[PDB]
Amino acid sequence: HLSRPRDIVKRSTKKYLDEPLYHRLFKDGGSEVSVRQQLNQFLKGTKHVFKWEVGDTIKKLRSRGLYYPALKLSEVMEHRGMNKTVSDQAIHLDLVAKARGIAAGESYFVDLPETSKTELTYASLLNCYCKELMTEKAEGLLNKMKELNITVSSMSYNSLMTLYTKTGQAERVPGMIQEMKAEDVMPDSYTYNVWMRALAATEDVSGVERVIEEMNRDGRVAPDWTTYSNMASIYVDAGLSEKAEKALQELEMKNTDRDFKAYQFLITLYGRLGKLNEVYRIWRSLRLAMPKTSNVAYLNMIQVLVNLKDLPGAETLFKEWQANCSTYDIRVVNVMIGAYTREGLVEKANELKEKSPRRGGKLNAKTWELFMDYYVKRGETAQALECITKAVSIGKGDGGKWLPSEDTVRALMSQFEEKKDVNGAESLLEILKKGTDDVGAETFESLIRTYAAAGKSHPAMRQRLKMEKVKVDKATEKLLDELC
RNA sequence: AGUUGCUUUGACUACAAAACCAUGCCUCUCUCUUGGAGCGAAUUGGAUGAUCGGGCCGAGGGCAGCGUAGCGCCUCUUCCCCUCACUCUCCUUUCCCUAAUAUGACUUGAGUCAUCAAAGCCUUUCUGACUCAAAAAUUUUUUAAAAAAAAAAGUCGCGUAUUUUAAUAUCGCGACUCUAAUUUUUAGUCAAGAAGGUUGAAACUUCCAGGAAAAAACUUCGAAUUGGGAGGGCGAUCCUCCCGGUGAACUGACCGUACCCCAAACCGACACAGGUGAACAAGUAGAGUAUACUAGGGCGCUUGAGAGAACCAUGUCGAAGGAACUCGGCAAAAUGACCCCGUAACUUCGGGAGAAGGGGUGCUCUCCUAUCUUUUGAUUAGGAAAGCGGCACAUACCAGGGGGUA
RNA sequence: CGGAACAGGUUUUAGAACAGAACUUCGAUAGGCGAGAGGUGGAAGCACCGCGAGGUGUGGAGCCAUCUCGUACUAAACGAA
Ligand SMILES: [K+]
Ligand SMILES: [Mg+2]
Ligand SMILES: [Mg+2]
Ligand SMILES: [Mg+2]
Ligand SMILES: [Mg+2]
Ligand SMILES: [Mg+2]
Ligand SMILES: [Mg+2]
Ligand SMILES: [Mg+2]
Ligand SMILES: [Mg+2]
Ligand SMILES: [Mg+2]
Ligand SMILES: [Mg+2]
Ligand SMILES: [Mg+2]
Ligand SMILES: [Mg+2]
Ligand SMILES: [Mg+2]
Ligand SMILES: [Mg+2]
Ligand SMILES: [Mg+2]
Ligand SMILES: [Mg+2]
Ligand SMILES: [Mg+2]
Ligand SMILES: [Mg+2]
Ligand SMILES: [Mg+2]
Ligand SMILES: [Mg+2]
Ligand SMILES: [Mg+2]
Ligand SMILES: [Mg+2]
Ligand SMILES: [Mg+2]
């Protein structure tokens, strides 16, 4: 056709790729390593691509959080001769801020030419400010835009409102919506969504009934399932049930594209309400919308079923996931691991722990956290020590460090008080020392008295000055300076 | 000296949606590519009930031929297939509607904008996965010891009976497919990044005339300053080994740098048509750095206004003749490019030879060939065949006159 | 002939400068404008035929170095000099 001459089916195979780039980069999987390997193999080749092909590739790589390969492809293909326009420069600015940080994004914006510093680049930098929560520089961009008469779109106002909601100054939203209505700016559905969220955050449930009637009066915005998701979340957190069911049934009517996240929202909202029959009603629709169901829907479903106490249904779902799983997801195991430790059927939890790494799932930290929860409920402390050591050795799955909860630490130390396990208390303190540099809220401030078994340590209040100036209760130093 | 490399390579598609509350352990743990649940229809279905019609099997008495068993004719309705109502829960063929199919809705009219070390190699170094080396772990066999090995699941098939009804399981078997683990340290492979250096900046073949020097620079070894450790030491800060040994948010002094540089600034008495190394130098035509025209960059040459005599310099053209001119074809004219046909006397066999003498050359359409086409169902080069225009198709510029004989 | 002849301006059959000859506003001397002769050879636009290079018609068409005729519009006595 004359509309689209650069067709991807009829194009030459000697010059161009045999399959589209957004199909080629995802051949070996969606993993970071496989995407990087595919990009490295492609950039060394002698086959070429289209500009719209690279644009859709950038959007697909951005849509799954793959920011480094998207930035690398954009930089290399611009270096090879593909000229960025203003829109492509806005997308590249957002990609730079996503990958190398806002300090790199600011330098890219400065090094941009002057005729490229238009409303698209300004709005992209504003969004990259609000997503990184820098209120002062945000407002410094805002008054500069208002001074230079750059057209402020609804996207910028929604970005500021989401920034206000996340920072905690959520009372500014009702002033700002009337500001953007006074400045002749029509809103979108996300404007009503953040307005509703700020109104519910202001402890005002009765205000969300006058906004829905106003957008019904407007007649210009299309209501979407995200609106009803916000209504369902606000009502379920507020305890109202029938209005939440009406919102969720309207949500089910609005989900015409069979969205996986929307189905997850139905499942978790009906699970938090507690209605098992309609939970299974949406679940059968989910199995009718995707036969090869991913592990995320199982992760939601089995957690909902065990929070609604359907344990043999969860056990049959486990066998279904076993017989149809391609990746042995450890979180699926770890849901019923914590289930079997909470209801105490510990032999089957131990069997799953043994059989997971053979089938191909290595243990993360939360399984050991649930087992030390089990051991701190049943009073065995040595096995809680053996669990917390392996938990801090594994650490977090995103590169963080695992730290035990304050309530569990407090209960474990109260258990240490009775048995006079000074060695156990010292090992727990050493573990917390390795975990964190601070180590103290209630950890040892009133907990010198575990030394009241036989003698005490040497330093006499000088060790307690070492760990960054802690302060103890007034009724704690008396048995300390009695024993000197 | 000759070949091969150094010789640039791409995009043009118009696109801010990257701002999200739920569960949250890195919540898409890895989704590239799936028709619809339309209250939508037509043939078909049918989870249903009879009537009418047609059509088997069969049931008896018999007319009929035996000691049981018969061949045609004669009274029957079950049973099947239609038919008329109810009818949407499984199945076949279609049609409408929706979704999906990558965004949105003349100036490459022969251009604009980027790129201008790619590809290798060698030292480190951060982080992942795999093979593991080997040990501790559990089963069998052999005599507490020594040898080999699986652990976890799905699927097909066989024979056989336990419930208070989650019997899709249990009982023994045979086979296929799939995954790699509980603890420990070392190597090695890859993968993905960050620092340096180095090559590309030259390789190969042939030839005879046989193609600089240098404890300067570099690689190696030796010895080693003002450093830190390990074993001796009736000593004296001495012996014997190991590590470091020019390393860095140290430091890098001194001289030149203006301007002209085929020129009005240098060598020629002149602001002199002369002389003055090498490197770079877009486009169209072209074998080409020839030649014509041109953008960028630079310049308009430090005397002008008229008139358009003789004569002089320098060009264009010239009837008929064509060297009759003159010391002499002096000068001028003429030939001139690529492809094809053809090419003598003589000879030291290498040559003469581009001998001499001829023919074609533009443009359009259609075929065929290939171009080692990085947009292959149409773009470039060649050849065939048919046409079109003019006086002229090497149309301007560039560009051998030839032969005979001393 | 006696405010005569010159000079100045527009030119030319004349011409190196000079000189000669024509005209100098009650004036066709030069330019312009219009018409014709002469030269070249069939414009542009439109239409028809052909895939195309191209061909045919409107049409001895279009154009202008010169020459002649008509005409004071411009410059020559716009010298109220
Ligand atoms: K120069
Ligand atoms: Mg030396
Ligand atoms: Mg200079
Ligand atoms: Mg001079
Ligand atoms: Mg001069
Ligand atoms: Mg000179
Ligand atoms: Mg030249
Ligand atoms: Mg110029
Ligand atoms: Mg002359
Ligand atoms: Mg003549
Ligand atoms: Mg002649
Ligand atoms: Mg002749
Ligand atoms: Mg004579
Ligand atoms: Mg003679
Ligand atoms: Mg003579
Ligand atoms: Mg001559
Ligand atoms: Mg000549
Ligand atoms: Mg041809
Ligand atoms: Mg030429
Ligand atoms: Mg007079
Ligand atoms: Mg005169
Ligand atoms: Mg006249
Ligand atoms: Mg005539
Ligand atoms: Mg003409």
mmCIF file of C-alpha atoms in Angstrom, chain A residues 152-453:
data_model
loop_
_atom_site.group_PDB
_atom_site.id
_atom_site.type_symbol
_atom_site.label_atom_id
_atom_site.label_comp_id
_atom_site.label_asym_id
_atom_site.label_seq_id
_atom_site.Cartn_x
_atom_site.Cartn_y
_atom_site.Cartn_z
ATOM 1 C CA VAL A 152 1.731 22.283 30.183
ATOM 2 C CA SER A 153 -0.081 19.092 29.238
ATOM 3 C CA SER A 154 -2.290 16.977 31.487
ATOM 4 C CA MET A 155 0.607 14.500 31.778
ATOM 5 C CA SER A 156 2.681 17.065 33.695
ATOM 6 C CA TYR A 157 -0.167 17.786 36.119
ATOM 7 C CA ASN A 158 -0.774 14.074 36.681
ATOM 8 C CA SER A 159 2.961 13.621 37.291
ATOM 9 C CA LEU A 160 2.917 16.398 39.893
ATOM 10 C CA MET A 161 -0.183 14.906 41.521
ATOM 11 C CA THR A 162 1.409 11.453 41.700
ATOM 12 C CA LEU A 163 4.513 13.133 43.147
ATOM 13 C CA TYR A 164 2.336 14.859 45.772
ATOM 14 C CA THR A 165 0.558 11.593 46.612
ATOM 15 C CA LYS A 166 3.799 9.639 46.983
ATOM 16 C CA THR A 167 5.612 12.350 48.961
ATOM 17 C CA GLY A 168 2.794 12.961 51.432
ATOM 18 C CA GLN A 169 1.531 16.426 50.521
ATOM 19 C CA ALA A 170 -1.680 14.949 49.156
ATOM 20 C CA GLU A 171 -3.779 17.964 50.205
ATOM 21 C CA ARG A 172 -2.430 19.993 47.277
ATOM 22 C CA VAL A 173 -4.346 17.874 44.734
ATOM 23 C CA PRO A 174 -7.812 19.538 45.105
ATOM 24 C CA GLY A 175 -6.220 22.942 44.533
ATOM 25 C CA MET A 176 -4.253 21.654 41.550
ATOM 26 C CA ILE A 177 -7.215 20.031 39.787
ATOM 27 C CA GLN A 178 -9.107 23.326 39.910
ATOM 28 C CA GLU A 179 -5.929 25.062 38.720
ATOM 29 C CA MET A 180 -5.723 22.806 35.660
ATOM 30 C CA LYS A 181 -9.466 23.219 35.095
ATOM 31 C CA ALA A 182 -9.077 27.007 35.266
ATOM 32 C CA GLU A 183 -6.163 26.933 32.810
ATOM 33 C CA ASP A 184 -8.332 25.229 30.122
ATOM 34 C CA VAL A 185 -6.795 21.743 30.324
ATOM 35 C CA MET A 186 -9.025 18.725 29.834
ATOM 36 C CA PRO A 187 -8.246 15.720 32.069
ATOM 37 C CA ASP A 188 -7.783 12.032 31.354
ATOM 38 C CA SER A 189 -8.836 8.983 33.380
ATOM 39 C CA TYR A 190 -5.569 8.957 35.338
ATOM 40 C CA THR A 191 -6.378 12.453 36.605
ATOM 41 C CA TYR A 192 -9.560 11.105 38.195
ATOM 42 C CA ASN A 193 -7.622 8.085 39.476
ATOM 43 C CA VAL A 194 -5.049 10.178 41.353
ATOM 44 C CA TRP A 195 -7.796 12.552 42.530
ATOM 45 C CA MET A 196 -9.672 9.573 43.991
ATOM 46 C CA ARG A 197 -6.515 8.175 45.594
ATOM 47 C CA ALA A 198 -5.640 11.507 47.230
ATOM 48 C CA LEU A 199 -9.225 11.939 48.445
ATOM 49 C CA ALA A 200 -9.191 8.469 50.002
ATOM 50 C CA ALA A 201 -5.781 9.234 51.516
ATOM 51 C CA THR A 202 -7.260 12.364 53.138
ATOM 52 C CA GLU A 203 -9.597 10.063 55.175
ATOM 53 C CA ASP A 204 -12.598 11.287 53.140
ATOM 54 C CA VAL A 205 -14.617 8.382 51.756
ATOM 55 C CA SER A 206 -17.677 10.513 50.928
ATOM 56 C CA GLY A 207 -15.721 12.637 48.439
ATOM 57 C CA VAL A 208 -15.261 9.882 45.842
ATOM 58 C CA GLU A 209 -18.995 9.939 45.072
ATOM 59 C CA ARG A 210 -18.963 13.529 43.765
ATOM 60 C CA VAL A 211 -16.055 12.912 41.371
ATOM 61 C CA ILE A 212 -17.611 9.944 39.570
ATOM 62 C CA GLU A 213 -20.785 11.985 39.045
ATOM 63 C CA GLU A 214 -18.708 14.865 37.652
ATOM 64 C CA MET A 215 -16.936 12.660 35.131
ATOM 65 C CA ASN A 216 -20.310 11.174 34.204
ATOM 66 C CA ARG A 217 -21.442 14.783 33.676
ATOM 67 C CA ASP A 218 -18.363 15.521 31.542
ATOM 68 C CA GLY A 219 -19.071 12.860 28.925
ATOM 69 C CA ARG A 220 -15.635 13.351 27.354
ATOM 70 C CA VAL A 221 -13.438 10.780 29.126
ATOM 71 C CA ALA A 222 -13.927 7.068 28.642
ATOM 72 C CA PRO A 223 -14.211 5.163 31.934
ATOM 73 C CA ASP A 224 -11.770 2.261 32.035
ATOM 74 C CA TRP A 225 -11.085 -0.742 34.235
ATOM 75 C CA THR A 226 -8.294 1.115 36.038
ATOM 76 C CA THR A 227 -10.926 3.547 37.362
ATOM 77 C CA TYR A 228 -12.984 0.684 38.790
ATOM 78 C CA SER A 229 -9.793 -0.890 40.134
ATOM 79 C CA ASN A 230 -9.163 2.312 42.082
ATOM 80 C CA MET A 231 -12.798 2.339 43.277
ATOM 81 C CA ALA A 232 -12.603 -1.327 44.315
ATOM 82 C CA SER A 233 -9.335 -0.822 46.202
ATOM 83 C CA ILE A 234 -10.620 2.272 48.027
ATOM 84 C CA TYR A 235 -13.931 0.636 48.977
ATOM 85 C CA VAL A 236 -12.373 -2.671 50.075
ATOM 86 C CA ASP A 237 -9.824 -0.820 52.207
ATOM 87 C CA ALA A 238 -12.735 1.217 53.618
ATOM 88 C CA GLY A 239 -14.776 -1.913 54.420
ATOM 89 C CA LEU A 240 -17.725 -1.192 52.113
ATOM 90 C CA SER A 241 -18.812 -4.321 50.248
ATOM 91 C CA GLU A 242 -21.813 -3.870 47.936
ATOM 92 C CA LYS A 243 -20.421 -0.743 46.269
ATOM 93 C CA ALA A 244 -17.139 -2.636 45.867
ATOM 94 C CA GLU A 245 -19.030 -5.481 44.176
ATOM 95 C CA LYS A 246 -20.743 -3.018 41.830
ATOM 96 C CA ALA A 247 -17.363 -1.462 40.999
ATOM 97 C CA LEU A 248 -15.838 -4.897 40.393
ATOM 98 C CA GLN A 249 -18.726 -6.046 38.189
ATOM 99 C CA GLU A 250 -18.380 -2.844 36.157
ATOM 100 C CA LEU A 251 -14.652 -3.640 36.018
ATOM 101 C CA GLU A 252 -15.452 -7.104 34.642
ATOM 102 C CA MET A 253 -17.678 -5.472 32.026
ATOM 103 C CA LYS A 254 -14.929 -2.986 31.088
ATOM 104 C CA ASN A 255 -12.237 -5.680 30.701
ATOM 105 C CA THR A 256 -12.887 -6.497 27.052
ATOM 106 C CA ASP A 257 -9.238 -7.149 26.125
ATOM 107 C CA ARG A 258 -8.766 -9.944 28.742
ATOM 108 C CA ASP A 259 -5.869 -8.229 30.496
ATOM 109 C CA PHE A 260 -3.735 -10.414 32.771
ATOM 110 C CA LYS A 261 -3.178 -7.662 35.345
ATOM 111 C CA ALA A 262 -6.912 -6.906 35.328
ATOM 112 C CA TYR A 263 -7.686 -10.571 36.021
ATOM 113 C CA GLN A 264 -5.097 -10.512 38.822
ATOM 114 C CA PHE A 265 -6.944 -7.500 40.241
ATOM 115 C CA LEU A 266 -10.269 -9.356 40.178
ATOM 116 C CA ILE A 267 -8.694 -12.347 41.901
ATOM 117 C CA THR A 268 -7.016 -10.356 44.666
ATOM 118 C CA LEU A 269 -9.990 -8.042 45.250
ATOM 119 C CA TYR A 270 -12.492 -10.897 45.475
ATOM 120 C CA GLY A 271 -10.047 -12.764 47.707
ATOM 121 C CA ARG A 272 -9.710 -9.787 50.034
ATOM 122 C CA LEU A 273 -13.501 -9.588 50.094
ATOM 123 C CA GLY A 274 -13.788 -13.327 50.801
ATOM 124 C CA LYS A 275 -16.244 -14.699 48.225
ATOM 125 C CA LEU A 276 -14.966 -18.120 47.130
ATOM 126 C CA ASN A 277 -17.560 -18.901 44.443
ATOM 127 C CA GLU A 278 -16.908 -15.738 42.469
ATOM 128 C CA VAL A 279 -13.157 -16.138 43.035
ATOM 129 C CA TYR A 280 -13.478 -19.442 41.174
ATOM 130 C CA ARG A 281 -15.852 -17.720 38.697
ATOM 131 C CA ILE A 282 -13.115 -15.300 37.649
ATOM 132 C CA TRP A 283 -10.484 -18.063 37.829
ATOM 133 C CA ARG A 284 -12.247 -20.242 35.258
ATOM 134 C CA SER A 285 -12.442 -17.208 32.961
ATOM 135 C CA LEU A 286 -8.684 -16.755 33.444
ATOM 136 C CA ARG A 287 -8.057 -20.358 32.438
ATOM 137 C CA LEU A 288 -10.364 -19.720 29.459
ATOM 138 C CA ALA A 289 -8.306 -16.635 28.540
ATOM 139 C CA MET A 290 -4.885 -18.304 28.719
ATOM 140 C CA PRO A 291 -4.336 -22.087 28.568
ATOM 141 C CA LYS A 292 -0.617 -21.939 29.404
ATOM 142 C CA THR A 293 -1.015 -19.833 32.519
ATOM 143 C CA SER A 294 2.064 -18.111 33.914
ATOM 144 C CA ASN A 295 3.276 -18.536 37.476
ATOM 145 C CA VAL A 296 2.080 -15.093 38.613
ATOM 146 C CA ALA A 297 -1.603 -16.029 38.431
ATOM 147 C CA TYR A 298 -0.884 -19.215 40.398
ATOM 148 C CA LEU A 299 1.051 -17.140 42.953
ATOM 149 C CA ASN A 300 -1.964 -14.895 43.432
ATOM 150 C CA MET A 301 -4.542 -17.711 43.350
ATOM 151 C CA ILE A 302 -2.975 -20.103 45.862
ATOM 152 C CA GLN A 303 -2.266 -17.260 48.307
ATOM 153 C CA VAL A 304 -5.918 -16.166 47.980
ATOM 154 C CA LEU A 305 -7.100 -19.749 48.531
ATOM 155 C CA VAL A 306 -4.952 -20.251 51.612
ATOM 156 C CA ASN A 307 -6.063 -16.896 53.017
ATOM 157 C CA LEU A 308 -9.637 -18.126 52.432
ATOM 158 C CA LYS A 309 -8.753 -21.570 53.900
ATOM 159 C CA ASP A 310 -9.129 -23.942 50.924
ATOM 160 C CA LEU A 311 -6.157 -26.220 51.530
ATOM 161 C CA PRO A 312 -6.982 -29.318 49.385
ATOM 162 C CA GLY A 313 -7.918 -26.950 46.557
ATOM 163 C CA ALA A 314 -4.482 -25.393 46.993
ATOM 164 C CA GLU A 315 -2.970 -28.897 47.054
ATOM 165 C CA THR A 316 -4.629 -29.805 43.739
ATOM 166 C CA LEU A 317 -3.541 -26.468 42.250
ATOM 167 C CA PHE A 318 -0.003 -27.392 43.333
ATOM 168 C CA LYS A 319 -0.159 -30.606 41.298
ATOM 169 C CA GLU A 320 -1.566 -28.697 38.315
ATOM 170 C CA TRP A 321 1.317 -26.192 38.543
ATOM 171 C CA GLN A 322 3.785 -29.081 38.857
ATOM 172 C CA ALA A 323 2.415 -30.847 35.780
ATOM 173 C CA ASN A 324 2.275 -27.667 33.680
ATOM 174 C CA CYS A 325 5.155 -25.467 34.912
ATOM 175 C CA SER A 326 8.111 -24.604 32.687
ATOM 176 C CA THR A 327 10.065 -22.610 35.284
ATOM 177 C CA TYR A 328 10.120 -23.998 38.815
ATOM 178 C CA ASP A 329 9.063 -20.808 40.607
ATOM 179 C CA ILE A 330 10.194 -20.760 44.233
ATOM 180 C CA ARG A 331 7.535 -18.264 45.392
ATOM 181 C CA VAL A 332 4.826 -20.801 44.510
ATOM 182 C CA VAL A 333 6.532 -23.268 46.826
ATOM 183 C CA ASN A 334 7.086 -20.580 49.494
ATOM 184 C CA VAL A 335 3.362 -19.774 49.710
ATOM 185 C CA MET A 336 2.384 -23.257 50.854
ATOM 186 C CA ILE A 337 5.643 -23.599 52.770
ATOM 187 C CA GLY A 338 4.447 -20.807 55.032
ATOM 188 C CA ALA A 339 0.983 -22.322 54.952
ATOM 189 C CA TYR A 340 2.242 -25.682 56.197
ATOM 190 C CA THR A 341 4.371 -23.992 58.871
ATOM 191 C CA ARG A 342 1.403 -21.872 60.013
ATOM 192 C CA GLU A 343 -0.920 -24.875 60.340
ATOM 193 C CA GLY A 344 1.999 -26.921 61.663
ATOM 194 C CA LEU A 345 2.084 -29.810 59.156
ATOM 195 C CA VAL A 346 5.847 -29.472 59.109
ATOM 196 C CA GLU A 347 6.824 -32.821 57.549
ATOM 197 C CA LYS A 348 5.295 -31.895 54.182
ATOM 198 C CA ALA A 349 6.946 -28.463 54.322
ATOM 199 C CA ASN A 350 10.271 -30.205 54.941
ATOM 200 C CA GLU A 351 9.544 -32.552 52.024
ATOM 201 C CA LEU A 352 8.939 -29.587 49.708
ATOM 202 C CA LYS A 353 12.138 -27.933 50.992
ATOM 203 C CA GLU A 354 14.108 -31.093 50.204
ATOM 204 C CA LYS A 355 12.540 -31.721 46.791
ATOM 205 C CA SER A 356 12.617 -28.150 45.416
ATOM 206 C CA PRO A 357 16.363 -27.858 44.510
ATOM 207 C CA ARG A 358 16.398 -31.246 42.774
ATOM 208 C CA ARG A 359 13.521 -30.209 40.515
ATOM 209 C CA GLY A 360 15.286 -26.898 39.956
ATOM 210 C CA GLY A 361 14.337 -24.282 42.519
ATOM 211 C CA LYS A 362 17.073 -22.872 44.736
ATOM 212 C CA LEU A 363 16.039 -21.587 48.149
ATOM 213 C CA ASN A 364 15.542 -17.857 48.599
ATOM 214 C CA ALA A 365 15.419 -15.996 51.920
ATOM 215 C CA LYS A 366 11.673 -15.928 52.559
ATOM 216 C CA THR A 367 11.377 -19.685 52.902
ATOM 217 C CA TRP A 368 13.962 -19.523 55.728
ATOM 218 C CA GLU A 369 12.098 -16.518 57.161
ATOM 219 C CA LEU A 370 8.888 -18.567 57.313
ATOM 220 C CA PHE A 371 10.709 -21.505 58.909
ATOM 221 C CA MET A 372 12.305 -19.304 61.544
ATOM 222 C CA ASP A 373 8.801 -17.910 62.110
ATOM 223 C CA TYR A 374 7.724 -21.510 62.722
ATOM 224 C CA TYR A 375 10.667 -22.147 65.051
ATOM 225 C CA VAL A 376 10.139 -18.903 66.991
ATOM 226 C CA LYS A 377 6.494 -19.878 67.418
ATOM 227 C CA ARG A 378 7.420 -23.353 68.682
ATOM 228 C CA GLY A 379 10.225 -22.137 70.908
ATOM 229 C CA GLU A 380 13.246 -23.920 69.425
ATOM 230 C CA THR A 381 16.025 -21.317 69.216
ATOM 231 C CA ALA A 382 18.995 -23.214 67.775
ATOM 232 C CA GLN A 383 17.039 -23.985 64.621
ATOM 233 C CA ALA A 384 15.976 -20.331 64.451
ATOM 234 C CA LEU A 385 19.698 -19.492 64.524
ATOM 235 C CA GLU A 386 20.341 -21.999 61.724
ATOM 236 C CA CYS A 387 17.505 -20.451 59.712
ATOM 237 C CA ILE A 388 18.596 -16.826 60.163
ATOM 238 C CA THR A 389 22.208 -17.653 59.198
ATOM 239 C CA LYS A 390 21.133 -19.172 55.874
ATOM 240 C CA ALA A 391 18.667 -16.308 55.347
ATOM 241 C CA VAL A 392 21.360 -13.654 55.718
ATOM 242 C CA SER A 393 23.745 -15.747 53.608
ATOM 243 C CA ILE A 394 21.209 -15.827 50.769
ATOM 244 C CA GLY A 395 20.167 -12.203 51.200
ATOM 245 C CA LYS A 396 17.544 -10.522 49.076
ATOM 246 C CA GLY A 397 16.730 -11.434 45.489
ATOM 247 C CA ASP A 398 17.292 -7.950 44.049
ATOM 248 C CA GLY A 399 20.767 -7.474 45.529
ATOM 249 C CA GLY A 400 19.729 -6.175 48.943
ATOM 250 C CA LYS A 401 20.596 -7.509 52.381
ATOM 251 C CA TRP A 402 18.138 -9.428 54.549
ATOM 252 C CA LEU A 403 17.294 -8.005 57.983
ATOM 253 C CA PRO A 404 15.043 -9.806 60.507
ATOM 254 C CA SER A 405 11.871 -8.123 61.712
ATOM 255 C CA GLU A 406 11.870 -6.151 64.958
ATOM 256 C CA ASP A 407 8.957 -8.068 66.510
ATOM 257 C CA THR A 408 10.574 -11.434 65.767
ATOM 258 C CA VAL A 409 13.938 -10.220 67.102
ATOM 259 C CA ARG A 410 12.198 -8.938 70.254
ATOM 260 C CA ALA A 411 10.371 -12.242 70.779
ATOM 261 C CA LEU A 412 13.550 -14.257 70.161
ATOM 262 C CA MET A 413 15.459 -12.200 72.707
ATOM 263 C CA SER A 414 12.642 -12.605 75.238
ATOM 264 C CA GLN A 415 12.976 -16.343 74.619
ATOM 265 C CA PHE A 416 16.721 -15.982 75.228
ATOM 266 C CA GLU A 417 16.058 -14.271 78.577
ATOM 267 C CA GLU A 418 14.428 -17.306 80.182
ATOM 268 C CA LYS A 419 16.913 -20.053 79.262
ATOM 269 C CA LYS A 420 19.889 -17.745 80.031
ATOM 270 C CA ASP A 421 21.362 -18.516 76.610
ATOM 271 C CA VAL A 422 24.130 -15.928 76.649
ATOM 272 C CA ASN A 423 25.861 -17.716 73.763
ATOM 273 C CA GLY A 424 22.663 -17.554 71.717
ATOM 274 C CA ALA A 425 22.235 -13.867 72.544
ATOM 275 C CA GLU A 426 25.847 -13.171 71.533
ATOM 276 C CA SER A 427 25.396 -15.048 68.246
ATOM 277 C CA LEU A 428 22.185 -13.122 67.492
ATOM 278 C CA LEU A 429 23.955 -9.841 68.274
ATOM 279 C CA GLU A 430 26.853 -10.797 65.984
ATOM 280 C CA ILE A 431 24.367 -11.652 63.220
ATOM 281 C CA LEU A 432 22.665 -8.271 63.626
ATOM 282 C CA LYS A 433 26.094 -6.578 63.679
ATOM 283 C CA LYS A 434 26.905 -8.125 60.302
ATOM 284 C CA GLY A 435 23.439 -7.230 59.022
ATOM 285 C CA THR A 436 23.306 -3.573 60.048
ATOM 286 C CA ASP A 437 25.701 -0.940 61.380
ATOM 287 C CA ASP A 438 23.185 0.548 63.846
ATOM 288 C CA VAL A 439 21.823 -2.429 65.889
ATOM 289 C CA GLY A 440 19.484 -0.965 68.392
ATOM 290 C CA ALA A 441 15.936 0.117 69.105
ATOM 291 C CA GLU A 442 15.016 -2.396 71.799
ATOM 292 C CA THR A 443 17.560 -5.071 70.847
ATOM 293 C CA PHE A 444 19.926 -4.821 73.804
ATOM 294 C CA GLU A 445 18.996 -1.509 75.483
ATOM 295 C CA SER A 446 16.876 -3.178 78.161
ATOM 296 C CA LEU A 447 18.486 -6.554 77.422
ATOM 297 C CA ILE A 448 21.680 -6.532 79.465
ATOM 298 C CA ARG A 449 19.895 -8.791 81.992
ATOM 299 C CA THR A 450 20.503 -11.877 79.849
ATOM 300 C CA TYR A 451 24.017 -11.528 81.275
ATOM 301 C CA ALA A 452 22.501 -12.102 84.744
ATOM 302 C CA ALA A 453 23.342 -15.822 84.759
#
